[PDB]
Amino acid sequence: MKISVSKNDLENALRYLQAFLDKKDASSIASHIHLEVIKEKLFLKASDSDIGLKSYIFTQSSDKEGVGTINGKKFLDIISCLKDSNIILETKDDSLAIKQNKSSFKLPMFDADEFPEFPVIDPKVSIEVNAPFLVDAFKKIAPVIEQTSHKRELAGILMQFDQKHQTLSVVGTDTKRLSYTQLEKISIHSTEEDISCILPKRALLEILKLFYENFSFKSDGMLAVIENEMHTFFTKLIDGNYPDYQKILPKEYISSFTLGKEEFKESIKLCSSLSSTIKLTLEKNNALFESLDSEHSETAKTSVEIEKGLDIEKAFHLGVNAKFFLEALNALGTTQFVLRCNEPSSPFLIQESLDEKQSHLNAKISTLMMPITL
């Protein structure tokens, strides 16, 4: 192996690959990145059976093609200490030499056959993603997903494909809040009419680092593979049947109040200094907030005026988890939000203002939430 590459190209590829390495035992191949030069490209990959990344960068010059490995952490540390000019990488019998002007480094390579095979699938489902809407939905939904949840399938995010109606539904929950969206007019190529892929939280968080728009998503009902111009990412799916979210959603809502998002954030944040739960009191022209499960002797109260009068005969009292209410508001792209309610003891919905209106670039995430009693 012998090549020249751009320092910036190489450093960037190495940063992304860090999260796929077990870095603590430097003597194990699990701490190494597999290297392969083929034609005018350097391929770098770090993976195991469950999750992995294969990246590539263009060579500036190419002299010998071949394979090798190198400790990924030490490789990034070295490159980040160099100038922004080309770097010469060259093997010397199970050792990689790294050269930039007057600086030179040797690191040992391991057997490249000890690296696991990068998997390849025959897809049952595939889409092209040319806009930010899907990763937006992933980013907005992620905070409600618990990796340690009891129900196996709730520890990841749900992607439910309806190729008949051309919708991709994206759903996450911890049983206390459920956040969802239904992305429209998605060109879904599938052998099945309805197929479900559950991505583990771990993999979801890596997808947010690696992709934005202009990538493909493919799956065979076992693995998910995602690819853009630079990267090929894969993860194993979570096996099982994610519960039907549409049967959990209430049919109708008695009341639907249009309220100020930032005003509600401020007030809830303010009251949550002393308590994880809050008592919300909605009147015709006011919203009152009080700390609820604070230690005794501690109180925090505030209110806010509602100019555009709510349809409230009396006074609606709702106990809410502060953090969960905030995160639901944080997932909304509008300046106002709709709070849809039945009784104080039953689930309530938080969603954007004009949620039925169609969007292109971003997802609209709605959140159903169990209230606190009293």
- Which residues contact its own copies by CB under 8 A? 26, 74, 77-78, 81-82, 95, 102-108, 266, 269-270, 273-274, 295-304
When the beta carbons of 146 and 263 are compared against ligand 1FL, the nearer one is 146
Binding status of residue 221 toward ligand 1FL by CB under 6 A? no
When the beta carbons of 92 and 185 are compared against its own copies, the nearer one is 92
User: Within 119-178, which residues bind ligand 1FL (CB under 6 A)?
Assistant: 151, 173, 175-178
> If contact means CB under 5 to 8 A according to the sort of partner, which of ligand 1FL, its own copies, none does residue 369 touch?
ligand 1FL
User: Within 175-204, which residues bind ligand 1FL (CB under 6 A)?
Assistant: 175-178
In one-letter notation, the amino acid at residue 72 is: G
> If contact means CB under 5 to 8 A according to the sort of partner, which of ligand 1FL, its own copies, none does residue 81 touch?
its own copies
d(CA 241, CA 54): 30
Please give the DSSP secondary-structure letter assigned to residue 372: B
> If contact means CB under 5 to 8 A according to the sort of partner, which of ligand 1FL, its own copies, none does residue 19 touch?
none
> If contact means CB under 5 to 8 A according to the sort of partner, which of ligand 1FL, its own copies, none does residue 282 touch?
none
DSSP states of 28-91 as a string? SGGGEEEEEEETTEEEEEEE-SSEEEEEEEE-SEEEE-EEEEEEHHHHHHHHHTS-SS-EEEEE
In one-letter notation, the amino acid at residue 293 is: D
Min CB(95)–ligand 1FL separation in Å: 36
> If contact means CB under 5 to 8 A according to the sort of partner, which of ligand 1FL, its own copies, none does residue 82 touch?
its own copies
> Reduced to 3 states, what is the DSSP secondary structure of residue 212?
coil
Distance separating the N- and C-terminal Cα atoms of the chain? 69
Binding status of residue 370 toward ligand 1FL by CB under 6 A? yes
Give the rounded distance of the alpha carbon of 134 from its chain centre.
Answer: 10
> Reduced to 3 states, what is the DSSP secondary structure of residue 256?
strand
Q: Which residues of 139-155 are buried (b: 16+ CB within 10 A; e: fewer)?
A: bbbbbbbbeeeeeebbb
> If contact means CB under 5 to 8 A according to the sort of partner, which of its own copies, ligand 1FL, none does residue 178 touch?
ligand 1FL
Footprint of ligand 1FL (CB under 6 A): 151, 173, 175-178, 243, 248, 347, 368-370
